[PDB]
């Protein structure tokens, strides 16, 4: 029986404070804050069953760009049919891998849009996924 | 200059209805749809504990065939322990992938067998699950 | 026999629920696990103690330590980015966690996947390979 030491793990607040900003975001690079939460802002209002989502590439990843990177989704469609949607619009094969992933972890299949959304959006009222062929963001 | 766009994505019913014919199955085009409503309605009404699951392999699979294609499933099992019980079936190499899908998705390891059949059954009372080497269906 | 009929869960307990291999297990007896487990939850109520190790089968680092002792509250997900980092992995490289020879849910929390899953000797065991199969 060890009295060895136990690796004391940091808790849900203290990772979400670590890796904050970890994920790369052109588009929030690009746009200013208060122009990104206004804009968030009211496209909720006008559209409360959808919700608004930025997908961009890990930098990592070795994988075809999206034409796009703004999204509006329906609430009631799961992570696993957007998924089967951006495949498409990669214009990937079935076998090949893609991932998703918010703040660094890869969401279940199971959860709705509209779930992931409110569990994670940011203070500029936009969801934010990078994708990669990786199963790690990096 | 105006606001970029939003790529406006399709909502779950429309999801099922562009993607119901995707998935194949040779149990359901040998067994007429009336014979299937009747022999499912009479396993379900006799056996409220246990779930009517169709194990398929997905057309384009590599995957080894399956000897026995029809399961009654103790509902209280999750779709991980369910999958593990298959992957010895199949006598499986644990360095080759196995996936299942049921509407071109792959269903939660957590989720018990009968979340699954309330929330994905056909209207034959039976749960259609396809398994493949590959990550998604198509 | 038509329809295929499968075991339930005192068999498949019975079978399996000891049937991942642990170096811990076999180098510190029952009666010192079960003490420590017991007198580490009852000093970090919000906490949880856990063994993450190497499938026998895989080919991935092991690594340098062994037992974890993790806020409840973290997910799955969010461990397993933390362990991926110890392991020092490569963002190419693959790797999957099993307990009780199935891969958990990321969104699930370690404090639920304690509750659910740890043994007698109150520590919950994580297996981890490069295979997505435990072996």
Redo the contacts between chains.
Sequence with gaps: ??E?????????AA?DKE?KDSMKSTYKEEHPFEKRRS?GEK?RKKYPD?V?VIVEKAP?ARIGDLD?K?????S???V???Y??I?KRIHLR??D??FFFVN????????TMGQLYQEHHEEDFFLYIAY?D?????
């Design positions: 029986g060890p060895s030491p136990f690796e004391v793990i940091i808790d849900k990772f890796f804009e496209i959808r608004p990592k796009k703004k999204y509006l989704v329906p009631d469609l799961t696993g049919q957007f089967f949607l495949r079935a076998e891998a893609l660094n972890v890869i969401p279940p299949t199971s959860a990669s990786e199963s790690v963001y990096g």
